Design a protein around this ligand. Sequence first.
Ligand SMILES: O=C(Nc1cncc2ccccc12)[C@@H]1CCOc2ccc(Cl)cc21
Ligand SMILES: O=C(Nc1cncc2ccccc12)[C@@H]1CCOc2ccc(Cl)cc21
Lengths: 304, 304
Amino acid sequence: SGFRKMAFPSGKVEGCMVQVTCGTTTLNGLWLDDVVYCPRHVICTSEDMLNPNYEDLLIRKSNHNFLVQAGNVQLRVIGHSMQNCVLKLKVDTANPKTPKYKFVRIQPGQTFSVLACYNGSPSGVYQCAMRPNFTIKGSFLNGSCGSVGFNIDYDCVSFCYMHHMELPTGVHAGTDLEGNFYGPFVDRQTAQAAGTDTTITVNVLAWLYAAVINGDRWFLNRFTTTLNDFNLVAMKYNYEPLTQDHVDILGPLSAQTGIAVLDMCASLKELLQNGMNGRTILGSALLEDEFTPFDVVRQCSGVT
Amino acid sequence: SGFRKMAFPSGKVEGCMVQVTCGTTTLNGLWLDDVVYCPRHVICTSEDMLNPNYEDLLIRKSNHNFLVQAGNVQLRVIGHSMQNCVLKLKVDTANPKTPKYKFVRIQPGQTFSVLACYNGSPSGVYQCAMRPNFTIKGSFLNGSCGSVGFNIDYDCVSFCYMHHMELPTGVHAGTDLEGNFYGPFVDRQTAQAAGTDTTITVNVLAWLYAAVINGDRWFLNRFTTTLNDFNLVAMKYNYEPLTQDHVDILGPLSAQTGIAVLDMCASLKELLQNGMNGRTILGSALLEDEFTPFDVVRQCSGVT
Ligand SMILES: O=C(Nc1cncc2ccccc12)[C@@H]1CCOc2ccc(Cl)cc21
Ligand SMILES: O=C(Nc1cncc2ccccc12)[C@@H]1CCOc2ccc(Cl)cc21
């Protein structure tokens, strides 16, 4: 029992982290096989970031300008290329610690673990969600660029995020491992609208099921609702509309607790309309949306 | 910017996890050098747990009865001994992945990372605090026993906790790596009073400083207080009395923000007396006590 904001064990990713320096800029890189992946803004000075022409900036750089260090050992760079907003530095040595891996583009509302790094060294790991507006509320300081987000299924690390930028609002933006930004963001020091965010309804419902499994049941009521009625309330409270696909994903948790999804929706409706009344659910005084139904089943079943 | 419940990178600890089986019971062990550490209740059947005489139960066991497996490879056990509530299984091979390590007994109110494991395999990592009542609010299922808590300072892992038991109340109890329980707990299936818990005042103040550093300042007021006045309020709200040692530990955060510790105490006093009024601090609708002043400075400075 107990329910925590649990991250995946970071060991497989720690073995991939390297430092990349270009000129006066240093950030993190991800070394998989014989390629080092890093944010393309490593080639920029602070002045270049206002309106960078990355193609022109990269032309002034050669293999020997990218200093890649894995721990205390230097890697020899034999090729470089830009793919969207990432640089791919071909090295002469395959990382002996490369785990089984995949590059995936996650959907908004899904979760992942972040291994925050500085100078190629891991500092910490935390779990988070990709917001419906394609930002992440991470914990990142200057030098954290190139730190990655990932999920692990048995021995396979699915890399989904590479950190690039902190918006003036304090939220974070980044790319998939092919260098494509999540959201409308561009790698430039210019104010950028993140756009309206919403609460991940399916995740709040998953977390209410986690609460029931772990003993917190005070919010269960004698009511039910329909998808249409629930969605009128979701609209009012800036929650994502619940769909039958979301109900279907919640099936395993509904079977485990015996609480029909629409009955749990009615509990969520009452909580949205009345608040918590000074009470807590799983140690939180607000409705948590950073656990997917898969996360709840995994944490409550002990998948390794 | 951003502030998360960040755990230490778990890689160094992942390399130490093994499975230990004795008879029909399987749990996790920690392999450091040529010794495997695990909870002594591995020698018990479910029936034995009501009132176990561990000395007698261990006498019926020989080296060959403890099956230790690191991944898919079996370790040869050449010695066994009980130290308090842990078993130390001497193996013929030193763990090649042993990090630099220390065994430490943490104080109540300090924090640490937990690598939850099942069958010697890591499932997740999370951060938590040792409660003032010596319990931890973890996330542990059956088979998680032997999972460890730790802190990391550069290359040294300081192991502080080994998981042993879940109390009927859903909270967790365990030992230091010398097998001494934190708190009054005994390794027996008997109802056990955890005793009154309190809120870790110095940690809430540290987290309020983290909030100010990360932009959340709405709770700052025009007031100040004294240690005596603040402690009258702390008494009423079941908070630990604040001492000059706590004020001294908060020095670095007071210097970083320019907010005197007693002025931050007055903000905490107002929050305790008035509540949050539907507002949030660092994404939380309650006062967080699981970040120490050291955690706040580390996370806000990027120590690797
Ligand atoms: O955001 C950036 N770095 C950081 C990333 N995450 C957390 C940070 C916290 C504090 C300071 C810097 C942080 C860089 C520097 C600013 O100009 C830009 C503009 C665009 C891009 Cl892609 C990156 C950057
Ligand atoms: O608590 C124990 N195991 C667990 C530990 N953590 C989370 C659990 C969640 C669900 C079921 C078991 C869990 C064992 C089994 C019960 O009897 C005892 C009594 C004493 C001791 Cl030291 C251990 C144990």
